[PDB]
Structure 1
Amino acid sequence: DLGTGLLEALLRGDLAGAEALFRRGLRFWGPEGVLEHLLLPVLREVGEAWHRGEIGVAEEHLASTFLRARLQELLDLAGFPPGPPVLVTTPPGERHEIGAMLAAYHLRRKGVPALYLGPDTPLPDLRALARRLGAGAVVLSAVLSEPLRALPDGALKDLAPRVFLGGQGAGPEEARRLGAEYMEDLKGLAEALWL
């Protein structure tokens, strides 16, 4: 797999060769393909390696900053459609960005105007922006479960006309308790908007 190659280039600080390997993968598998076969497998392997204590925090930072940059390029290539926006973010306390960015990307690939805000947005401020921009939906990505548990019952229900929760840190019951529609796969998300 180009996965091991990509990781090894990043770990030796070869950002030029890492970029070249990613670009080859994008040319070979296309935009959706490269995410499934390269970006996510590498991100998972970086996390695992760190958990095993095989790499330190600096190396993980390097890799994650790089993958985030590639995903941002893909986001930018999808363009930004006009229309009532969908705000994409993470719950308060959640700092991980890639799951939200992936969600924004899948929406944008299907012509949905997904505004990625960045992570960790307070719920009242998110509700206020959704209202001001006449947003049709809010989408939330949770990697950790703790930030969801800290939230009062029904706290996600009124953020916008539709509210979607996904990510490892989320499950059907916590979604029900919080008042959000739970969603496992990213492909289905655009269809779930009924447009």
Structure 2
Amino acid sequence: EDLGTGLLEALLRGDLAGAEALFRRGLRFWGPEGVLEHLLLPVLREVGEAWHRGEIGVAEEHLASTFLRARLQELLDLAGFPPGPPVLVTTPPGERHEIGAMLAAYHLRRKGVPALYLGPDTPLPDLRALARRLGAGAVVLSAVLSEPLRALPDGALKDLAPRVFLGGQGAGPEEARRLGAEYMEDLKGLAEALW
């Protein structure tokens, strides 16, 4: 059974009940991390590709994307949330794509790290202020597009927390170096990189 085609088709026809049932079949088959890798991310990528090819309009993407963000938020709220100093997770100013940051928070919480997901697009002064006030051990940023990072001045990220991690499709090792962050490729390596 092709859950990815089935789920995208259900979303494009506005069949949210079918879509929710199909996502849950994927959760049961692949497990929590696995459903994100094998179902949620492939469908979001395909939605993007269909839009880029001119095949679907913006409303159709929004319908699918909004639904999948809700499913990941549901999973995130069911993960543990330890006491202790938090890790703040957001996206750079100008970055409205939020699912990468949500995935980072999720992977962290599933390994017993109290990741606070702020939502996207947080001005750096306000992010630093909050990280310092809460005694955050780290700040994690997800960059989906490269332009928001290119807009930032050299060293912009270095003072945000004791550790500052940057990843996503829009990020790369050279950009992380210019901005003063540690570049991280894999979500699984985040908790490890802390412990």
Q: TM-score, normalised by structure 2?
A: 0.98
Give a deviation string over 1:56-102, Cα, whole Å, max 9, x none.
00000000000000000110110321110000000000000000000
User: Aligned equivalents of 1:13 and 1:191: distance in 2?
Assistant: 40
Out of 107-116 and 75-84, give the one that drifted further: 75-84
Q: Counterpart of 1:70?
A: 71
User: Aligned equivalents of 1:183 and 1:175: distance in 2?
Assistant: 9
Q: Counterpart of 2:168?
A: 167
User: Aligned equivalents of 1:180 and 1:4: distance in 2?
Assistant: 38
* 3-state SS in 2 of match to 1:192: helix
User: Aligned equivalents of 1:182 and 1:122: distance in 2?
Assistant: 20
* 3-state SS in 2 of match to 1:115: strand
User: Aligned equivalents of 2:153 and 2:37: distance in 1?
Assistant: 35
User: Aligned equivalents of 2:28 and 2:170: distance in 1?
Assistant: 32
Shift of 1:150: 0.9
Structure 1 position 22 matched with structure 2 position 44: no
Give a deviation string over 1:128-155, Cα, whole Å, max 9, x none.
0000000000000001111111111111
Give a deviation string over 1:155-187, Cα, whole Å, max 9, x none.
100100000000110110010000000001100
User: Aligned equivalents of 1:27 and 1:131: distance in 2?
Assistant: 39
Q: Counterpart of 2:87?
A: 86
- Any runs of at least 4 consecutive aligned residues in structure 1 with deviations exceeding 6 A, and if so which? none
User: Aligned equivalents of 1:79 and 1:14: distance in 2?
Assistant: 31
Out of 11-20 and 24-33, give the one that drifted further: 24-33
Shift of 1:27: 1.0
Shift of 1:33: 1.0
User: Aligned equivalents of 1:108 and 1:33: distance in 2?
Assistant: 16
* 3-state SS in 2 of match to 1:143: coil
User: Aligned equivalents of 1:134 and 1:113: distance in 2?
Assistant: 12
User: Aligned equivalents of 2:193 and 2:80: distance in 1?
Assistant: 21
User: Aligned equivalents of 1:79 and 1:185: distance in 2?
Assistant: 21
User: Aligned equivalents of 2:123 and 2:79: distance in 1?
Assistant: 28
Shift of 1:22: 0.4
Q: TM-score, normalised by structure 1?
A: 0.98
Give a deviation string over 1:10-40, Cα, whole Å, max 9, x none.
0111000000000111111110110111000
User: Aligned equivalents of 2:35 and 2:80: distance in 1?
Assistant: 18
User: Aligned equivalents of 2:60 and 2:81: distance in 1?
Assistant: 33
Count of residues paired in the alignment: 194
Q: Which consecutive residues of structure 2, in runs of 5 or more, have no partner in the other structure?
A: none
